Amino acid sequence: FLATTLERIEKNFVITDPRLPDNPIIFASDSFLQLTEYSREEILGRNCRFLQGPETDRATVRKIRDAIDNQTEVTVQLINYTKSGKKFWNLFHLQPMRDQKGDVQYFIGVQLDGTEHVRDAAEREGVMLIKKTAENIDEAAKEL
Numbered sequence: 167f168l169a170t171t172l173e174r175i176e177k178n179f180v181i182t183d184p185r186l187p188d189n190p191i192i193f194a195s196d197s198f199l200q201l202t203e204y205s206r207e208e209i210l211g212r213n214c215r216f217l218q219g220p221e222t223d224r225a226t227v228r229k230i231r232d233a234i235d236n237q238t239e240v241t242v243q244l245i246n247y248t249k250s251g252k253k254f255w256n257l258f259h260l261q262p263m264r265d266q267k268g269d270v271q272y273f274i275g276v277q278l279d280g281t282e283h284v285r286d287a288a289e290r291e292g293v294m295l296i297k298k299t300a301e302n303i304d305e306a307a308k309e310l
């Protein structure tokens with residue numbers, strides 16, 4: 167699966183299609199693949215929960231579940247794992263992408279990887295970056 171132009175955008179993100187069973191990944195950026203160590207072929211058609219592992223806070227995962235079910239945005243931080251089992255902190259932002267009648271068509275997920283739970287200035291700057299990134303991908307996804 168050769169990268170589309172969308173997938174060559176130099177940010178970590180995935181797009182899922184909630185019409186397909188278990189809301190699977192249909193697009194994943196090259197940066198996301200570099201971060202997580204998976205090939206595109208390995209993760210297309212899978213739900214993103216494969217990134218979770220033993221030290222992932224399950225209460226935080228439920229916050230994400232609730233946002234998806236209520237079709238709203240959420241921003242959380244949680245521990246995720248690469249294919250080889252390397253841990254990273256993920257400052258994660260979810261938002262729905264809506265069509266011209268306001269119905270949700272896709273979900274966008276943006277990941278900012280780090281080595282620690284961030285707070286205060288680092289958190290603020292991280293959230294600035296991931297929200298701007300989500301906006302750019304929302305525009306890009308409009309014509310998919």
Ligand SMILES: Cc1cc2nc3c(=O)[nH]c(=O)nc-3n(C[C@H](O)[C@H](O)[C@H](O)COP(=O)(O)O)c2cc1C
Pocket residue numbers: 180181182189213214215217218227228230231234244246256258260273274275276277
């Ligand atoms: C667009 C999108 C991106 C997601 N990205 C991540 C991610 O980076 N890390 C993660 O742990 N979960 C991610 N998730 C959340 C899981 O896919 C799943 O929704 C979560 O585990 C809650 O559902 P579950 O209880 O059925 O597992 C993402 C979900 C969506 C829709």
